[PDB]
A paper describes a structure:
The methylation of lysine residues of histone proteins is a dynamic process that is regulated by SAM-dependent histone lysine methyltransferases, FAD- or Fe(II)/2OG-dependent histone demethylases, and reader proteins (also known as effector proteins) that specifically recognize post-translationally modified lysines in histones and affect the downstream cellular processes. The highest methylation state Kme3 is specifically recognized by a structurally diverse class of reader proteins, including plant homeodomain (PHD) zinc fingers, WD40 repeats and members of the Royal superfamily (tudor domain, chromodomain and PWWP domain), in the surface-groove binding mode. Our study reveals that the association between trimethyllysine and the aromatic cage of reader proteins is driven by energetically favourable cation–π interactions between the positively charged trimethyllysine and the electron-rich aromatic cage, and the trimethyllysine-mediated release of non-optimally structured water molecules that occupy the aromatic cages of reader proteins.
To elucidate the underlying chemical basis for the recognition of natural Kme3 by reader proteins, we have carried out detailed comparative studies for binding of 10-mer histone peptides that contain the positively charged Kme3, its neutral carba analogue Cme3, and the glycine residue that lacks the entire side chain at the fourth position of histone 3 (that is, H3K4me3, H3C4me3 and H3G4). We have chosen the simplest uncharged Cme3 analogue to directly probe the involvement of the proposed cation–π interactions in reader–histone associations, because it has virtually the same size, shape and polarizability as the positively charged Kme3, but lacks the presence of the fixed positive charge. We solved three X-ray crystal structures for complexes with JARID1A, TAF3 and SGF29 at 1.6–2.8 Å resolution. All three reader–H3C4me3 structures clearly illustrated that the uncharged side chain of C4me3 is positioned well inside the aromatic cages of JARID1A, TAF3 and SGF29, virtually in the same binding mode as the positively charged Kme3. The calculated average values of the root-mean-squared deviation for binding of ‘Cme3' and ‘Kme3'–aromatic cage pairs were: 0.124 Å for JARID1A, 0.261 Å for TAF3 and 0.108 Å for SGF29, respectively, suggesting essentially the same complexation mode engaging in aromatic pocket residues upon binding of neutral C4me3. Similar features have also been observed for binding of H3C4me3 and H3K4me3 to TAF3 with 48.3% buried SASA for H3C4me3 and 50.1% buried SASA for H3K4me3, and to SGF29 with 48.6 and 47.3% buried SASA for H3C4me3 and H3K4me3, respectively.
Residue numbers in the entry:
A (entry chain A): 114 to 287
B (entry chain D): 1 to 4
The structure:
Amino acid sequence: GRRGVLMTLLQQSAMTLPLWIGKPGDKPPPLCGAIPASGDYVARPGDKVAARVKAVDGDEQWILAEVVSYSHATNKYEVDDIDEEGKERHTLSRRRVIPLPQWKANPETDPEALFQKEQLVLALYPQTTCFYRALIHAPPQRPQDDYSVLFEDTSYADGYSPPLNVAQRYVVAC
Amino acid sequence: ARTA
């Protein structure tokens, strides 16, 4: 059903994120892993983003979305929810859009392009298409590996989830 | 979207 379709789609996108392969002297580019976008970067149609969207009832979530367009007339994006049950194309200010990484950082060659242990991030929560505040528990050891994170979770006495795995595609700065 |  929908849930299978969604989860599959999430994995496809995580798995297909290209590994940054530099040669000696190169530095990892903007949007490689944890390296942020350039100032006044504008994401391109088709690019995945974390988008801060307000429901009709006022509830704010960072959702997984795709850019449709950007208007320099208004400095607003249009973005679609990656979930087909999200039937609203959202008009969003730049500060409500965080571009997802366009390359995975290889821990074995460019570890400075990974988030450090205990850094605060927005991470996609397992089985959801939404991003939530979390601390880095462990960076990936190999190129194929996920981050381990502790989500802020007040259902726990210490305020944190157990370590949960999140792919590089889905961890961005908070 | 699917939320937590």
